[PDB]
Every structure is written in structure tokens, then in C-alpha cells.
Amino acid sequence: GGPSVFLFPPKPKDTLMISRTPEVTCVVVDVSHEDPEVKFNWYVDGVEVHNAKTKPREEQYNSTYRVVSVLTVLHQDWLNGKEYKCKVSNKALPAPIEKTISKAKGQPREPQVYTLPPSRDELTKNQVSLTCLVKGFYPSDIAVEWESNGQPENNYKTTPPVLDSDGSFFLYSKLTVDKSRWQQGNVFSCSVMHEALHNHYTQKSLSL
Amino acid sequence: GGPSVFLFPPKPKDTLMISRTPEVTCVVVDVSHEDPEVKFNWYVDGVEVHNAKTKPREEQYNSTYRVVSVLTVLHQDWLNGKEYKCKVSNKALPAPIEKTISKAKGQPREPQVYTLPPSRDELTKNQVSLTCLVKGFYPSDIAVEWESNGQPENNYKTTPPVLDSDGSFFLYSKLTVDKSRWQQGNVFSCSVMHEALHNHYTQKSLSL
Numbered sequence: 489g490g491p492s493v494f495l496f497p498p499k500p501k502d503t504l505m506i507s508r509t510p511e512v513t514c515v516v517v518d519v520s521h522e523d524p525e526v527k528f529n530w531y532v533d534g535v536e537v538h539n540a541k542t543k544p545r546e547e548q549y550n551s552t553y554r555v556v557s558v559l560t561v562l563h564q565d566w567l568n569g570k571e572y573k574c575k576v577s578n579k580a581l582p583a584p585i586e587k588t589i590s591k592a593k594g595q596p597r598e599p600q601v602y603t604l605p606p607s608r609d610e611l612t613k614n615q616v617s618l619t620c621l622v623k624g625f626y627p628s629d630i631a632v633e634w635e636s637n638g639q640p641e642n643n644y645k646t647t648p649p650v651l652d653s654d655g656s657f658f659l660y661s662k663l664t665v666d667k668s669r670w671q672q673g674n675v676f677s678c679s680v681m682h683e684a685l686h687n688h689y690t691q692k693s694l695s696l
Numbered sequence: 697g698g699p700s701v702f703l704f705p706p707k708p709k710d711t712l713m714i715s716r717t718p719e720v721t722c723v724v725v726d727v728s729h730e731d732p733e734v735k736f737n738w739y740v741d742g743v744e745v746h747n748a749k750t751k752p753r754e755e756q757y758n759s760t761y762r763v764v765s766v767l768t769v770l771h772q773d774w775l776n777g778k779e780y781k782c783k784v785s786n787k788a789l790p791a792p793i794e795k796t797i798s799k800a801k802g803q804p805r806e807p808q809v810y811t812l813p814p815s816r817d818e819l820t821k822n823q824v825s826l827t828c829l830v831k832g833f834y835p836s837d838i839a840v841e842w843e844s845n846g847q848p849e850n851n852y853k854t855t856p857p858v859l860d861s862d863g864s865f866f867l868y869s870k871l872t873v874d875k876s877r878w879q880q881g882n883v884f885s886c887s888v889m890h891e892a893l894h895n896h897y898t899q900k901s902l903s904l
């Protein structure tokens with residue numbers, strides 16, 4: 489083995505709302521016990537940066553260490569396609585190990601968002617399925633949530649993005665509710681957040 | 697480096713259709729380039745059964761070969777949860793790497809199949825989307841297809857299976873047709889194959 493590096497990007501929600509603070513997470517794994525001195529170097533677009541908050545190595549069950557540095561990125565810096573490079577140098581490795589991560593290259597396409605009622609055959613048991621189709625968006629970074637009457641609906645699952653034929657992405661959100669509420673006539677909302685949307689937000693609803 | 701070994705299961709369609717041939721495959725990546733020899737014995741519930749038509753070694757770009765064995769398996773055996781073990785006897789291995797695979801354990805659940813038509817929001821565009829919701833099935837091994845008037849429709853994408861709240865699986869399949877064809881009045885039908893289906897096959901139909 490040896491020390492291995494993993495670079496995870498921010499959560500799509502984090503970069504689309506100036507409210508949150510998107511961060512890029514470099515994690516060093518299997519740093520050995522003998523020499524566990526690990527240097528972190530951070531570059532944005534090749535230019536070295538130093539506002540990264542490296543954090544105290546945590547020793548693991550396997551008598552192996554694991555360090556994490558967190559670089560907070562600027563929302564527009566991520567959406568303007570900057571490239572974040574985590575360099576990790578260690579005494580137990582032939583050369584420093586590099587990793588770079590970015591938003592997917594390409595032209596952002598805007599998600600179409602529709603809402604699909606339950607079919608009749610399903611209207612036969614306790615709960616039915618309200619479907620939110622989101623298609624035609626690029627890149628795949630996206631967030632989906634449901635609510636109705638202002639409060640969050642929680643019994644819902646969202647499939648991962650799928651590559652469509654034209655090269656954009658689609659997904660579905662399925663929200664499961666009691667057939668009562670569906671037959672009552674309550675309206676439910678599928679809310680989508682994506683960088684190619686005005687205000688990074690749209691909302692589409694659905695009721696009897 | 698060294699010789700990593702990966703095992704893969706049959707295609708779901710293959711194990712449900714006596715017509716088709718289901719087979720397990722043992723991949724061997726990053727093979728020594730300065731010793732390149734490999735063995736395989738193959739066991740079903742322990743008992744060696746040897747049939748591994750080792751698809752004659754092949755070569756990939758990066759100093760690395762890729763030998764591959766494939767063993768036929770009985771249809772009912774795989775659905776009866778027997779374990780297929782690939783023991784890649786390699787003499788340049790520190791020790792013989794062993795790996796096992798079996799169908800998911802658990803009580804099979806029958807998929808429910810619902811046809812959802814396009815939204816009217818969607819009807820503006822040159823192509824609309826027909827949705828086949830497939831939910832409630834276990835295990836996740838499943839196959840979805842689209843066809844029109846007995847002939848295969850092919851411009852469709854299917855999301856992977858997703859674990860739902862009750863511990864079953866669901867997915868969705870999207871078929872894209874030019875509004876012309878939908879607006880006339882054609883029937884499109886979504887056919888699903890799953891182990892808990894009568895004859896491993898159902899089909900629900902959709903039309904204007």
C-alpha cells in the first residue's frame with residue numbers, strides 16, 4: 489500500500505447559495521506510523537494558495553494515520569471552472585502525490601423540470617408516487633428536494649444523474665405520500681437547484 | 697503494483713431467459729509483464745466444476761496484460777443463491793487470490809410497473825418523454841425494455857436501481873419519441889423482466 493490521496497469536491501448545494509461555504513476536501517490515507525509527516529500544498533489554477541485549514545492527523549484502528557485539509561473555495565470560483573490541486577509530500581513515497589478536481593468541463597445547460605402524477609393502477613394501496621422529472625441539465629451537479637405546505641416532505645428518493653442521448657443529464661425524484669393526501673387535493677413541490685437556473689432555483693408543484 | 701482480480705455476476709436478463717446464456721466472469725488486471733502466467737479452477741459451492749473457457753489472454757496499453765476466464769452457470773443455480781468462487785492460481789502471486797460472488801440474499805419481491813405519460817409543460821418541445829416507473833422489487837437484478845407495436849424502441853435511458861425506504865428497489869425508464877408519434881395515438885409498452893414475475897416478465901402499455 490502506502491499513503492493514498494482522495495479529493496472530494498463541494499456539495500452542489502454549497503456552491504449555489506452564497507449562504508453556505510463550499511469546500512474541497514483532500515484526505516491523506518494510510519500515512520505510516522514511522523514517518524507521518526505530510527505536507528499539503530494547494531493550488532487554484534496553478535497558483536499556490538494558503539488559506540487551507542489542515543487538520544490534526546487522526547490515528548485509526550489499523551495503527552495508520554489519516555490527515556485532512558479543507559480548502560474553502562469561492563462560489564463563483566468553482567462555477568467559473570477553477571481547478572483545485574492538492575499536493576501531498578511524504579517521507580515514505582517516491583514523489584509527492586498530486587490530485588486535481590474541478591467542475592465538469594462544458595457549457596451549462598438548464599434543467600427542464602416537470603411533475604408527474606401517480607397512475608391509476610397505483611391508486612390501489614396506501615401510498616402512491618409523485619414523480620419529478622428533471623432532464624437536460626449539464627453538468628450533473630444538482631440538488632432536489634420536496635415540500636408541500638411549505639414544510640419538507642421527507643419520504644422521497646432521488647436517482648443519481650443519468651447521461652442522456654444528447655449528452656446532458658436527467659434524473660427522477662420519487663416522493664411517497666399517503667393516498668389520502670393525494671386524494672385530498674394537497675399540492676406538493678419539487679424544488680431543484682442548479683447553476684444554469686436563474687437564482688439557482690426553480691420549483692414545480694402537483695396536486696389532484 | 698501487481699495482479700488485481702475482479703469477479704462479476706451474470707446479466708439479469710441472462711438468468712431469467714432459458715433462451716439466453718448466463719455466465720460469471722473473473723477478470724485479472726495489471727498482470728506481471730515479466731512472468732505473465734495464470735491459472736483458474738473455479739468452484740460452485742466448493743466443488744470444482746471446471747468449464748472456465750479462459751478467453752485467451754489479451755493486451756492493454758500500459759505494460760499490463762488482462763487474462764479473463766468465463767464460466768457458464770446454470771440458470772436455476774444462480775437464482776438458488778449458490779456461490780461461484782474464482783481461485784486465480786497465479787505462480788507470481790504472493791499467495792493465491794480467492795474471490796466469491798452470489799446473488800443477493802433475501803425474499804424476492806415483485807415489481808410493480810406504472811406508466812406515466814408526459815406532462816403538458818413538456819408538450820411544447822419537439823420530443824416528449826414517456827415514463828415507466830418500476831418499484832418495489834427485490835433483489836435489484838432487473839431488466840427494462842421499450843418496444844412499439846411489437847417492434848423494439850431504442851431511444852430510452854434507464855436509471856440504476858435505487859434502495860427505497862422499505863428496503864426494496866425502484867428505478868425509472870425514460871423513452872424519448874417525437875411528439876408527432878405520441879400525438880397521433882400509438883401505443884408504447886414497457887416490458888420488465890424480474891425473478892419474482894410470473895414467467896419473469898410483465899409489460900405495461902402507454903398511449904395517447
Ligand SMILES: *[C@@H]1O[C@H](CO)[C@@H](O[C@@H]2O[C@H](CO)[C@@H](O[C@@H]3O[C@H](CO[C@H]4O[C@H](CO)[C@@H](O)[C@H](O)[C@@H]4O[C@@H]4O[C@H](CO)[C@@H](O[C@@H]5O[C@H](CO)[C@H](O)[C@H](O)[C@H]5O)[C@H](O)[C@H]4NC(C)=O)[C@@H](O)[C@H](O[C@H]4O[C@H](CO)[C@@H](O)[C@H](O)[C@@H]4O[C@@H]4O[C@H](CO)[C@@H](O)[C@H](O)[C@H]4NC(C)=O)[C@@H]3O)[C@H](O)[C@H]2NC(C)=O)[C@H](O)[C@H]1NC(C)=O
Nearest residue numbers: 489494496497498499510511512513517518548550552554
Ligand atoms: C486504515 O483505516 C482507514 C480508515 O478506515 C482506511 O481508510 C480508507 O481507505 C480507503 C482506501 O483504501 C478509502 O476508500 C475511498 O473512499 C472514497 C469515498 O470515501 C467517502 O465516502 C466513504 C463512504 O463510502 C467515507 O467513509 C469516506 O470518509 C468518504 O466520505 C466523504 O468524505 C469527504 C471528506 O470528509 C466528504 O466531503 C466533504 O463533506 C463535507 C461535509 O458536508 C462538505 O460537504 C465538503 O464540501 C466535502 O468535501 C464527503 O461528504 C464524504 N462522503 C460521504 C458519503 O460521507 C472513494 O471515493 C474511493 O474510491 C475511489 O478510489 C478507488 C480506489 O481506491 C476506486 O476504486 C473508486 O472507483 C474511486 O475511484 C475514483 O472514482 C472517482 C469517481 O468515480 C473518479 O473521479 C476518480 O478518478 C477515481 N480515482 C481512482 C480510480 O483512482 C475509495 O473507495 C476510504 O475513504 C478510507 N476511509 C476513511 C475514513 O478515510 C484505510 O484504508 C485503512 N488501511 C488499511 C491498510 O486497512
Ligand SMILES: *[C@@H]1O[C@H](CO)[C@@H](O[C@@H]2O[C@H](CO)[C@@H](O[C@@H]3O[C@H](CO[C@H]4O[C@H](CO)[C@@H](O)[C@H](O)[C@@H]4O[C@@H]4O[C@H](CO)[C@@H](O[C@@H]5O[C@H](CO)[C@H](O)[C@H](O)[C@H]5O)[C@H](O)[C@H]4NC(C)=O)[C@@H](O)[C@H](O[C@H]4O[C@H](CO)[C@@H](O)[C@H](O)[C@@H]4O[C@@H]4O[C@H](CO)[C@@H](O)[C@H](O)[C@H]4NC(C)=O)[C@@H]3O)[C@H](O)[C@H]2NC(C)=O)[C@H](O)[C@H]1NC(C)=O
Nearest residue numbers: 700704705706707718719720721723725726756757758760
Ligand atoms: C492499465 O490499463 C488497464 C486496462 O484498461 C487497467 O485495467 C483496469 O484496472 C482496474 C483496477 O484498478 C479495474 O477497475 C475495476 O472495475 C470494476 C468494474 O469494472 C467494470 O466496469 C469497468 C468500467 O465501467 C470496465 O472497465 C470493466 O471491464 C468492468 O466491466 C465488466 O466486465 C465484466 C467482464 O467482461 C462484465 O461481466 C460480464 O459481462 C458480459 C458482457 O459485458 C456478460 O454480461 C456476462 O454475463 C457478464 O458476467 C460486466 O458486464 C462489465 N461491467 C460493466 C459495467 O461494463 C470494479 O468492480 C472495480 O471496483 C471495485 O474494486 C475497487 C478496488 O479499488 C473498489 O474501490 C470499488 O469500490 C469496487 O469494489 C467493490 O464494490 C462492490 C460494491 O460496493 C462490493 O460488493 C465489492 O466487495 C467491492 N470490492 C472491493 C472493495 O474489493 C474496479 O474499479 C478494471 O476492471 C480494469 N480494466 C479491465 C478492462 O478489466 C489497469 O488498471 C491499468 N494499470 C495501470 C497501472 O495504470
